[PDB]
A paper describes a structure:
The [name] family of small GTPases consists of four members, KRAS4A, KRAS4B, HRAS, and NRAS, which act as bi-directional molecular switches that cycle between an inactive GDP-bound form, and an active GTP-bound form. [name] mutations are the most common oncogenic drivers across human cancers, but there remains a paucity of clinically-validated pharmacological inhibitors of [name], as druggable pockets have proven difficult to identify. Here, we identify two [name]-binding Affimer proteins, K3 and K6, that inhibit nucleotide exchange and downstream signaling pathways with distinct isoform and mutant profiles. Here, we demonstrate the use of Affimer proteins, a scaffold-based biologic, to identify and directly probe two druggable pockets on wild-type [name] associated with inhibition of nucleotide exchange and effector molecule binding.
Residue numbers in the entry:
A (entry chain B): 4 to 92
B (entry chain A): -1 to 60, 65 to 166
Write the structure that this text describes.
Amino acid sequence: NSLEIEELARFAVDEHNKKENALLEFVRVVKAKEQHFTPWFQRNTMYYLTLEAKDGGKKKLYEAKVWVKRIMVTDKMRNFKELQEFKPV
Amino acid sequence: SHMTEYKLVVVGAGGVGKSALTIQLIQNHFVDEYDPTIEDSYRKQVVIDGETCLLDILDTAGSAMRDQYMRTGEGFLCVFAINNTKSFEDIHHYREQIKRVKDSEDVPMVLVGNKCDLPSRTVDTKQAQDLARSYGIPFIETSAKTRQGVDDAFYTLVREIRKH
Ligand SMILES: Nc1nc2c(ncn2[C@@H]2O[C@H](COP(=O)(O)OP(=O)(O)O)[C@@H](O)[C@H]2O)c(=O)[nH]1
Ligand SMILES: [Mg+2]
């Protein structure tokens, strides 16, 4: 799960670079908190990740919010992830 | 101990106070900022007319997803805000939609006019009471802020589900 969290942090940096016209280089996850939501037929999670990334060579701290929605449609799990916010500490 | 479980769905236009009503019922306080697109379900154990009830309440934000919510739901709290005319205009749409999906003329529901604590009012009791009459469902006014009518709205909906 430290892997899972690391994978979502990398995803957050990537999505920040693509959608917020940046070029940050992911170093590591500093801390993660997790908030769970279970509307019917779902197991959803908002992740609050503090992460370290290099901005033009210099290590800085960032707070990313990532939304993971997992929905049972028919009898098949559909998974979806989306960066909600990304800002410097 | 015997208990009966009820599946309740809270629907209405964005900003009418769906999240606030539910969290009032569940948590006994007013949440004036709750993410406007997040859905969640809640479970409350309560005694209604001497029956120990488990209410499984879905707080919608609004799809196939929404259709599923409606098939599963047994009773629907249709919420508007007394200081928003178009939230009141929208009610037809919600009711029509539920009647479409469940494919029944008789679906337990309750009409709720929320924010009745506020000195502004755009919708008259009588207008709402006329609509409720035409659909043959009850009307409660409520305030998620002051808890006025909150318990009563949910309890009334359970009574409606029993009637069927
Ligand atoms: N004064 C007052 N404000 C309310 C009431 N219910 C909700 N609100 C406010 O109206 C806004 C919408 O509430 P919310 O529950 O998020 O609406 P939702 O979009 O239907 O879930 C929030 O800022 C609430 O604090 C109420 O009964 N009285
Ligand atoms: Mg809400």
